[PDB]
Design a protein around this ligand. Sequence first.
Ligand SMILES: Nc1ncnc2c1ncn2[C@@H]1O[C@H](COP(=O)(O)OP(=O)(O)O)[C@@H](O)[C@H]1O
Ligand SMILES: Nc1ncnc2c1ncn2[C@@H]1O[C@H](COP(=O)(O)OP(=O)(O)O)[C@@H](O)[C@H]1O
Lengths: 691, 748
Amino acid sequence: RNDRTLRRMRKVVNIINAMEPEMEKLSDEELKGKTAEFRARLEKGEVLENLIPEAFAVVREASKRVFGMRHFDVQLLGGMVLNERCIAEMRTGEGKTLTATLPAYLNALTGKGVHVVTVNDYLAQRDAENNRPLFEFLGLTVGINLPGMPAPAKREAYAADITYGTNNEYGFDYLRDNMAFSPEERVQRKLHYALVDEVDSILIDEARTPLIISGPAEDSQNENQTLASITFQNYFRLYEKLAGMTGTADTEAFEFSSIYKLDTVVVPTNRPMIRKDLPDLVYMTEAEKIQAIIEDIKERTAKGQPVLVGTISIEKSELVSNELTKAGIKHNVLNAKFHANEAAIVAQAGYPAAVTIATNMAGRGTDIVLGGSWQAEVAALENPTAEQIEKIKADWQVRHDAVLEAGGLHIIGTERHESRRIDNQLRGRSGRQGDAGSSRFYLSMEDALMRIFASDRVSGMMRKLGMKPGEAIEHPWVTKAIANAQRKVESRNFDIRKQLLEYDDVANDQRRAIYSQRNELLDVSDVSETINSIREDVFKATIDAYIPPQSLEEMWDIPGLQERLKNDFDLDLPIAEWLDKEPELHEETLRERILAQSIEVYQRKEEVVGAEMMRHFEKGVMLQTLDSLWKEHLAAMDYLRQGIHLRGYAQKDPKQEYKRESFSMFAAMLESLKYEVISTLSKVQVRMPEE
Amino acid sequence: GSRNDRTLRRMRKVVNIINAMEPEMEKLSDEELKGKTAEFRARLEKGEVLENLIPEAFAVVREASKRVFGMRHFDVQLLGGMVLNERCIAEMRTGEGKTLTATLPAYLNALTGKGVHVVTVNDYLAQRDAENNRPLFEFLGLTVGINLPGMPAPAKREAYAADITYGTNNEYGFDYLRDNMAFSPEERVQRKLHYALVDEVDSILIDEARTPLIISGPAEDSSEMYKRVNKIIPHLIRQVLIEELLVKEGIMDEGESLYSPANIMLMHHVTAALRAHANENQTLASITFQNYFRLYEKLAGMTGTADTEAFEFSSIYKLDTVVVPTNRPMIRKDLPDLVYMTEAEKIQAIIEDIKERTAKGQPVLVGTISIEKSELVSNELTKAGIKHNVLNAKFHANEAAIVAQAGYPAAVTIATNMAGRGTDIVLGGSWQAEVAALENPTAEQIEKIKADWQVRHDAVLEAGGLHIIGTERHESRRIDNQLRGRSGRQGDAGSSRFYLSMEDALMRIFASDRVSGMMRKLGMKPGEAIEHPWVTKAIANAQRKVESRNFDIRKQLLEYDDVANDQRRAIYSQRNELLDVSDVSETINSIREDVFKATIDAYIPPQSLEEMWDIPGLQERLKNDFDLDLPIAEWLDKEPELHEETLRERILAQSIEVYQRKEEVVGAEMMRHFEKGVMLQTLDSLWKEHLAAMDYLRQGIHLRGYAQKDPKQEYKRESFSMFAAMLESLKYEVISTLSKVQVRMPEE
Ligand SMILES: Nc1ncnc2c1ncn2[C@@H]1O[C@H](COP(=O)(O)OP(=O)(O)O)[C@@H](O)[C@H]1O
Ligand SMILES: Nc1ncnc2c1ncn2[C@@H]1O[C@H](COP(=O)(O)OP(=O)(O)O)[C@@H](O)[C@H]1O
């Protein structure tokens, strides 16, 4: 764990580092050939992790030739973390994209494929095309999976060495593959490795979201229903190797373990992080709070320090905006209605004494360049020239160093959110890539978040410090108490979710079972041995209902057995005539003649239709019957789950009773499945030109 | 002499004069150009007409912009600027330089020293434009002001005292309103409303026409109201209702009704008391944008070739609209609308189009009405093997990167309710951008990037430029027009095509399911196709009937608003008269007479016999409302000889007498400012009372009832009637307040 894994990994980095001279003296085509060489050793039984030093040095050198970018040491480490069942926490702007090229390469080598999982189709395409040169230079192929892509193009994307696509599309492909009627219709290979780009949304927020295929035609208006379902959690759990990335904003390590058996490793930043996060400040009232904020801004901007003020609503942004104006402090508000205005304001938000106010600041952030962006500047030029640019960079170097000397970007949170990951994202907007920076959050006793101390009195004691319009002290214990209360809400919320997951696990295990069976059936061209085997189960169970085993003859319902056979097995047998003609029948030889009779009737149909046609008919029938009963069972399981309000109550766990019910329903479906297959095959009409 | 054609003919002659002035302006020093302003002002002071100044003043602005901004206005921008000097909307297409154009009218409309208000849609543009233009105009010897929310009143007065002011509609209006709550003239922050130049009139003037600006404060009557009214409630055995309800008390029952448009606040008290089972602010002041902008002596504004709404500007604001030509010929090819049986036939036709165009290297932008519709067309493009990108509103950084390459050869981009104006699509891609990954550029580097871009640029132009596919039209044609106008900007080749199907929602605008359902019979066979120009015109005419219909409905609302406006214009006119004078005594003396005459009329009927006089009603009336206890009867026992009119005189007289005493104790200046104060305050009170009671009458325009005996109109008459009653209660209450005012006399 911990530094032990990290210290061990650091030893590998020194080896990778020491290999670079050897790597720089190789030709491009020799570099290409290391992939062939890695695979030949793998073929001779080599352990993949033994190849990490050489494999990562090859990628680092290919990247410099191809991208003009050389993986940093910390990116080597992150690449190592992602080859295990691990989340790498890497800070924003640390290079997650390039880092991911490392484990992707390594885990492509055994020829089983790589699924790099993106949040949207834009990224899937962008990263596939950007990386295709790197990976072709190394003798690998790259695939792109999209919604709407024809099955042959998808098959091709999945046959590549490394594939890019969204989570949704991967999951939907799995479901549709589990509705195929021949193994050639499948688009995916075995699920080998999932490298997931942004695990907060993809693995945590979406864990229980069902992916569903829906079903126009059905059964006996005729509206549409669920044919196939899997949660995201249980899709990613089918993979042999699972890993992913997120930012240091974190707070959910214990969820990743609980939901996925994923460890999380915090990866060190390339440069030392020096952002000063100062103690949280508490004020009696919003008004005192806001005045404090105005005062901080006032002092900092006078120093030349840029500020970013994050609020929780439009109304509060307007309030702090109006008060800054009332104090004569120039600023800009990020207004969600004016996207162009916003990008233009962002661009210069790190300019000396810039003040920017943002409402529920969100996505990774567009970066804030200190001193300003100088590129927005040349971008704005219409015929930019050499001496023009260096003038521009020259004045910028000075603005940059000046903003740094002044303490870099100061972040002010005017309120904390209930989720600390949100606060962490705002504050992470400062101190990127080793830059000086600072952060401070403000609270009042009127703030909504004071309600997470589930007690007025407890909360309202804080006012006994008294605060007083200027003489503010600072108590560190408040920062920590607040962080503890956000942590408790998360814990509470998750405890509730994990009880929901334990229900989800009943469906999961059932789905895993039935899909395993289906796939066994799918992979086999001839299903005879099962048919024969299940025909005997079905005949025995059917017969038992009328001939209680080893009972006297007077308990037998030969009338009911005759019709049963007729109506379900198309089998019309003079059973009463047999008994009354052979005293020497006996039960067990009755069962045999019945079984034998259905079988020779089936053989006659087969002779008319043909063996191969028959084999394939059996297999189709088995798949189609599986599918029909499984859609039925999914709806029944659905109704049983929401019925969780009048069944298990006064000291019998409702969970334990649901599990009994669910197990009973599954076990019954599996018996129905055999019944219906044999009944279909029994009753299939065939024109006999004769007897 | 026709209309717009003739306008542009005459403006073009002026443009040729302005261009001829340019070498003269060139040769002038910077200080000489700065002096032009003072020289134009000396001319105006000696009686010159402003419009005689247009050519000189424009040559001056245009040469100042060269030297300062390094940009020289185009001839089309001179035209746009002359338009904006008139009560007109200059319609100039996206990309044409509205922001620079607007410096010309602003400069000219500043020369008379009365101020300009540039109106922006937000604070960011206000500020940016202010700062960007300060150097231009300070070069021309003028000053520039910025007005923002929260700005302190001194700062605000300075911004309005600048030559040219920038700010949002909202803040202009709110300043106005608060100026009308001032108790002294020096509290006002604005000057008289001279010229407003509105930057984007579609949102500011149309969409936002009826949006009220409201100042509220508890600034109210207290209670006792609620709780007297409470005390009926513990006998409401809920079994007719009105007579029951009426059942005595105060301020009603002399056989006066409860739902008189007059006892409206009272009735609201009971509607609230009894609806109550299942402080408050109040409006201190309100105005609409439409009625704010109508206060200005000159109004003008800009928008892009985004018309369709000309008839509403003229109807609502009396703004004419001039369509300004483009600096370069606008060659976008806007092709016949196509109509398909089914959504599915339509999409298939779209695909084939994108497919043939991208094979010849032309870029396509595909605009849809929803996310669902975007996913559909995208998936079908993927099914056809066609690469593209969707603009996903969740991924704003993705979207910016998509757009930057959206004019790239064979690029295909799908947009969901794409907005107006928006971020441009550069053909070939963006070449001063491309460098914006490039951390240390050189001689060779950009040169390269730029030449390479040229080849891409020229190849896209030769392929037809950007093609726009509208997959469905909107009900608003303005929107469709904003989408097609993404293409063919600044003289570039481009084209547009809109697609429609019988299954499309928009087919509903043809008020007959069967009349719509005819086209079916011109039955659109799959891969084949024809084009009929009458369909295109029919669709456009349908959209225009839908618009004109919604605007008939709006007009009716605006009739309601005309009542309010007329009442507020009149009371605020009375309020400002008062505010602007130190001494309101003549006003006061005049209205006490009026008040005293009429009060006496009510008991002594003019010319009456001394037995048609009621003094058991007259003297009480006096001691009650005026603190003026005159035992008149007991005079009248002594002088039977005196006569009605010289008794009215002696009545009057007294009140003056007792009031001059109150004054020689308080001080004349004190008394004078207390009187203006009483008059302002009383009018403020009654006004706010009126605003509330009308709000309540208006929401009687619901189920008090009636698509039947004309609700509106009855409303206008009850409202004007109550307004004219309020002006008389203002007079009576002022005089009551000043007659009852307590000030401690002498001693003993
Ligand atoms: N090793 C490197 N050498 C040079 N530039 C790098 C390196 N690693 C990443 N970058 C650049 O750093 C920036 C941030 O990387 P990105 O993957 O977009 O960041 P994040 O971790 O926030 O997703 C990008 O512009 C990327 O190309
Ligand atoms: N006369 C000119 N010469 C050179 N560039 C100009 C001129 N007028 C405007 N532009 C530029 O044209 C671009 C678009 O102008 P803007 O005022 O934003 O256009 P729009 O009419 O669509 O609002 C801006 O970058 C602007 O600075």
